[PDB]
Amino acid sequence: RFLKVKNWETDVVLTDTLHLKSTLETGCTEHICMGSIMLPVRTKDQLFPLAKEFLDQYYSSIKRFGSKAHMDRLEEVNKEIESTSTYQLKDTELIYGAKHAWRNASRCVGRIQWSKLQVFDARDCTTAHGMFNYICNHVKYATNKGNLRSAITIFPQRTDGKHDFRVWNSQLIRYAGYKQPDGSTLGDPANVQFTEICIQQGWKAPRGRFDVLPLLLQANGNDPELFQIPPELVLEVPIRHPKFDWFKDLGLKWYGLPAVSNMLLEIGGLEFSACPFSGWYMGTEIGVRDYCDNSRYNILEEVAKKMDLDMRKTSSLWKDQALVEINIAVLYSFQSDKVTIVDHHSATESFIKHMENEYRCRGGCPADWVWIVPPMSGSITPVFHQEMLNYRLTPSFEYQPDPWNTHVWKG
Amino acid sequence: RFLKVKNWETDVVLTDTLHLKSTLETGCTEHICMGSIMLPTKDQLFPLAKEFLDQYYSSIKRFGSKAHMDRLEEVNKEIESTSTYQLKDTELIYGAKHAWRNASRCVGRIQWSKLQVFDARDCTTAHGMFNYICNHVKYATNKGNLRSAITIFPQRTDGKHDFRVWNSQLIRYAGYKQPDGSTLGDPANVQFTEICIQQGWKAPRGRFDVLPLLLQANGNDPELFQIPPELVLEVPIRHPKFDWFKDLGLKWYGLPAVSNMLLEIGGLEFSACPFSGWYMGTEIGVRDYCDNSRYNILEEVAKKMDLDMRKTSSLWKDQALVEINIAVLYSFQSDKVTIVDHHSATESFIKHMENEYRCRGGCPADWVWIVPPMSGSITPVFHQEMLNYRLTPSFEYQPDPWNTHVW
Numbered sequence: 001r002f003l004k005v006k007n008w009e010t011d012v013v014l015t016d017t018l019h020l021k022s023t024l025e026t027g028c029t030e031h032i033c034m035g036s037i038m039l040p041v042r043t044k045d046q047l048f049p050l051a052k053e054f055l056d057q058y059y060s061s062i063k064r065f066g067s068k069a070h071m072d073r074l075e076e077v078n079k080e081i082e083s084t085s086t087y088q089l090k091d092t093e094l095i096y097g098a099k100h101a102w103r104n105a106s107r108c109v110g111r112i113q114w115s116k117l118q119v120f121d122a123r124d125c126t127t128a129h130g131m132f133n134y135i136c137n138h139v140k141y142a143t144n145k146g147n148l149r150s151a152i153t154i155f156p157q158r159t160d161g162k163h164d165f166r167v168w169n170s171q172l173i174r175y176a177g178y179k180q181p182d183g184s185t186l187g188d189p190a191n192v193q194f195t196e197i198c199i200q201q202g203w204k205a206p207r208g209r210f211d212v213l214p215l216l217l218q219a220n221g222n223d224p225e226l227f228q229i230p231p232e233l234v235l236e237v238p239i240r241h242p243k244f245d246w247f248k249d250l251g252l253k254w255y256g257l258p259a260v261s262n263m264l265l266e267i268g269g270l271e272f273s274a275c276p277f278s279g280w281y282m283g284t285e286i287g288v289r290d291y292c293d294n295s296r297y298n299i300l301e302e303v304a305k306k307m308d309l310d311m312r313k314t315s316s317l318w319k320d321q322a323l324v325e326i327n328i329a330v331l332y333s334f335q336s337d338k339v340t341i342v343d344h345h346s347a348t349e350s351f352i353k354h355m356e357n358e359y360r361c362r363g364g365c366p367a368d369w370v371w372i373v374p375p376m377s378g379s380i381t382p383v384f385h386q387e388m389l390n391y392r393l394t395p396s397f398e399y400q401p402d403p404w405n406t407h408v409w410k411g
Numbered sequence: 412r413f414l415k416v417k418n419w420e421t422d423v424v425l426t427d428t429l430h431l432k433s434t435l436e437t438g439c440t441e442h443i444c445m446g447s448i449m450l451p452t453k454d455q456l457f458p459l460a461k462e463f464l465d466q467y468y469s470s471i472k473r474f475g476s477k478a479h480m481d482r483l484e485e486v487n488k489e490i491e492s493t494s495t496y497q498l499k500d501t502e503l504i505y506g507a508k509h510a511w512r513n514a515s516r517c518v519g520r521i522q523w524s525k526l527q528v529f530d531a532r533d534c535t536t537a538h539g540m541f542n543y544i545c546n547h548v549k550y551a552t553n554k555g556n557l558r559s560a561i562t563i564f565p566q567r568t569d570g571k572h573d574f575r576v577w578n579s580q581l582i583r584y585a586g587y588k589q590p591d592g593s594t595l596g597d598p599a600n601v602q603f604t605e606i607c608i609q610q611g612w613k614a615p616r617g618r619f620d621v622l623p624l625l626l627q628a629n630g631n632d633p634e635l636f637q638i639p640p641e642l643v644l645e646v647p648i649r650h651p652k653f654d655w656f657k658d659l660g661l662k663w664y665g666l667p668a669v670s671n672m673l674l675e676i677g678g679l680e681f682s683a684c685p686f687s688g689w690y691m692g693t694e695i696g697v698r699d700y701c702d703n704s705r706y707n708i709l710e711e712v713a714k715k716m717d718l719d720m721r722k723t724s725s726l727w728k729d730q731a732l733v734e735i736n737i738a739v740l741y742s743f744q745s746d747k748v749t750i751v752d753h754h755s756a757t758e759s760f761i762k763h764m765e766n767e768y769r770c771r772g773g774c775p776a777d778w779v780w781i782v783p784p785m786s787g788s789i790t791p792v793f794h795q796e797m798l799n800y801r802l803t804p805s806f807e808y809q810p811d812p813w814n815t816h817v818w
């Protein structure tokens with residue numbers, strides 16, 4: 001079958017065939033769309049076809065499909081499966097796998113960069129201290145003194161589900177959140193629960209508004225251990241505004257490296273439960289969501305006051321006005337400090353070109369409109385006007401439950 | 412099969428049971444989501460009538476009553492003999508209100524039960540249609556104190572005698588292709604305008620010419636009429652801060668009135684059913700004014716503000732956008748014409764969602780459409796999970812009549 005998507009701004013129509021290669025379920029049916037829903041131990045049985053599907057894709061991509069090398073590899077994996085119940089990826093296959101998981105990530109607007117991913121193979125890691133060292137190296141490499149480089153570090157795959165490697169942090173770098181007795185929150189409200197666990201595990205909290213959280217690292221199914229990322233490796237940017245000199249006195253800053261550490265990487269049926277990855281920020285992630293969500297730092301009011309906007313009625317669009325200035329400040333500060341960042345206009349324009357290129361070369365590009373469109377100024381970016389099809393391809397990044405809900409404590 | 416929706420900002424969780432009454436299809440499958448795609452006989456008729464009459468009689472607490480059984484009986488006899496049936500006034504009003512109630516893309520549905528329904532099923536000619544439409548416009552406009560209304564023309568019979576309003580909205584501005592290659596007026600309306608001309612309109616080739624109605628009665632050829640200018644309330648757009656803003660020469664009309672949709676009630680099809688509410692400000696300031704394929708004024712405005720337009724990262728587009736939308740709201744409010752900002756409107760929709768879940772078991776909603784085209788995540792709907800599904804009675808899209816019309 002052929003599916004068409006239309007851009008309503010440009011009348012460009014693209015044709016999707018790639019969706020035929022999708023296996024996993026969306027959550028939607030003919031009778032309900034779950035497009036705006038955030039979230040809608042494996043036998044030898046299921047494993048070889050998954051391995052075979054993946055190796056066919058790998059060998060096609062290198063133009064060696066049907067080769068003796070291809071056939072020998074399938075054979076080797078098949079035997080390794082029923083002999084050992086799993087299998088190990090070659091380094092080349094892992095690298096291909098990680099890049100394609102990013103390529104297939106329907107919620108990521110930065111995928112124009114997918115082919116330039118630095119893959120760190122940490123499959124020889126055995127302990128939390130070992131995990132800490134690998135993650136330090138990832139952070140230093142990716143940060144690159146502000147000239148950010150995309151990277152992923154891949155820890156050993158799941159075996160029996162009882163020896164998982166996990167990074168308990170949702171991101172490698174995030175700020176602590178502290179719930180006060182009066183009900184107020186100091187720092188980042190999103191991280192109150194994780195902060196409390198860290199403290200219980202023995203972390204000494206400075207209890208400030210921007211305390212970098214320690215790493216909580218679980219190797220081989222063992223209880224997690226605490227580590228402090230060396231502060232000299234954590235690049236931060238004090239936030240100021242080009243025209244408003246009072247903006248600096250809000251005391252805002254943010255970290256330069258956005259590094260998701262709680263997802264699961266699936267490649268050929270193998271599951272990598274610890275696979276921290278990082279790119280660079282699109283400005284609105286910080287300026288719109290992190291700073292202005294009611295459930296986060298929630299600074300719209302204080303900013304609006306300092307600007308002396310009419311705050312008595314919403315139709316003054318005081319919130320909208322303050323929102324723009326904050327996002328100007330974030331971009332200004334990062335650029336001034338020579339730390340990589342991309343504005344939502346640049347990033348969405350690049351995504352459109354990426355998307356069209358993918359349609360031409362690959363037959364499609366799965367995309368989640370709900371996530372791709374930026375959280376401010378939606379229809380003045382080209383993605384708003386672009387029809388997209390969302391479907392799931394493997395290799396992929398998947399969500400997994402938070403480890404504190406599932407972990408069997410050793411004591 | 413019992414679905415939950417979460418608000419990620421408030422942690423409020425609602426349970427949806429209403430989706431299980433959905434019949435029509437979404438375009439989505441288990442393998443592909445089409446949520447961002449804009450447009451994804453006697454035996455057919457009776458179960459549809461039955462489904463509707465059942466919900467109607469349940470709504471007035473007479474489910475299973477004799478009047479219910481009698482009505483079902485009476486409609487069935489009528490379908491068998493006549494091939495169709497006629498709705499009682501009570502059923503027509505109920506159906507129209509519920510079509511709005513079920514409109515998953517409409518953010519203003521908290522108002523659904525206050526809809527004025529004008530029964531125009533006795534209309535026979537295009538002149539009669541014009542009269543009914545002028546009356547709708549005058550009623551709905553109400554000197555700037557807007558009131559929601561729908562006017563319902565006769566239902567489809569054999570598809571050969573369709574009533575159609577050829578306009579997409581009762582009130583829009585003309586579009587002209589100029590020889591200098593550009594476009595004067597609304598680019599969205601070039602095609603329709605040329606049909607206004609081919610059919611006889613004397614176009615004044617301006618930038619904001621209120622288009623004439625092209626009205627089709629009983630399957631006949633469409634006729635032209637000009638809405639009395641005195642019935643078209645317009646608003647000059649000024650900024651409360653920038654005195655230069657008025658020089659742009661911008662204005663908009665007060666009455667948003669969709670006229671090209673199809674109202675389905677109990678299997679019956681009303682191909683001509685213009686309806687109107689009042690504007691949410693972003694419709695005009697973000698979409699009408701700033702879409703690249705519409706009036707596309709961002710650059711002009713940015714220059715008048717003397718912004719650095721060299722680099723996208725100065726967010727000059729974003730800054731101009733807010734001010735344009737400030738001026739729209741300020742202008743309507745100053746001229747005392749009903750308008751709602753996107754914060755108030757989305758806040759009300761969250762309230763409506765909660766009422767609906769509580770009293771009806773759900774509320775079909777299209778997040779892609781409900782979230783405003785600016786400042787999305789600083790409105791509550793961004794953080795609200797929504798389930799989209801199709802209930803009847805419904806408003807449906809239908810083909811533009813110039814493609815369908817056997818002249």
Ligand code: HEM
Nearest residue numbers: 102105107108109110113150152277278279280281282397
């Ligand atoms: C290099 C520059 C990159 C940019 C500008 C970028 C941009 C974004 C943005 C704005 C989001 C939405 C985040 C949110 O709203 O929470 C996102 C999500 C995502 N990105 Fe990227 N990204 C980049 C790199 C990467 C890399 C290196 C990977 C993987 C190797 C990746 C995979 C993903 C995935 C899996 C998501 C979904 C995360 C979730 O569902 O919470 N991205 N990206």
Ligand code: HEM
Nearest residue numbers: 511514516517518519522559561686687688689690691806
């Ligand atoms: C009374 C105040 C109302 C408000 C504030 C309101 C708001 C809105 C908005 C903002 C949209 C999106 C429009 C667009 O982006 O093109 C919309 C769409 C829609 N509305 Fe309403 N509306 C109101 C009244 C009504 C009424 C009275 C009806 C029907 C009786 C209705 C039915 C619909 C339908 C069917 C759509 C989808 C239209 C389309 O797909 O183009 N609305 N509404």
Ligand SMILES: Fc1cccc(CCNCCNc2ccnc(-n3ccnc3)n2)c1
Nearest residue numbers: 038039108171258259260277278279280399
């Ligand atoms: F389905 C869900 C339900 C609740 C939370 C959620 C993840 C929320 N996203 C916040 C984290 N996003 C971030 C953070 C840092 N860095 C990136 N990042 C880096 C490269 N690409 C994205 N993304 C999904």
Ligand SMILES: Fc1cccc(CCNCCNc2ccnc(-n3ccnc3)n2)c1
Nearest residue numbers: 449450517580667668669686687688689808
């Ligand atoms: F699926 C689609 C494909 C092409 C155009 C499209 C609708 C475009 N928007 C026009 C409708 N918007 C308007 C205009 C005036 N008035 C209202 N309105 C009034 C009350 N509720 C909505 N809505 C859908």
Ligand SMILES: C[C@H](O)[C@H](O)[C@H]1CNc2nc(N)[nH]c(=O)c2N1
Nearest residue numbers: 036037038370371793794795796
């Ligand atoms: C309910 C809704 O799906 C949810 O708030 C989504 C909306 N779109 C998003 N888009 C991005 N990029 N990131 C998000 O966290 C969200 N949240």
Ligand SMILES: C[C@H](O)[C@H](O)[C@H]1CNc2nc(N)[nH]c(=O)c2N1
Nearest residue numbers: 384385386387447448449779780
């Ligand atoms: C392609 C995408 O579906 C399209 O641009 C939609 C996005 N959301 C929208 N939302 C509203 N309210 N109105 C629209 O016309 C659109 N257009």
Ligand SMILES: [Zn+2]
Nearest residue numbers: 028033439444
């Ligand atoms: Zn869907």
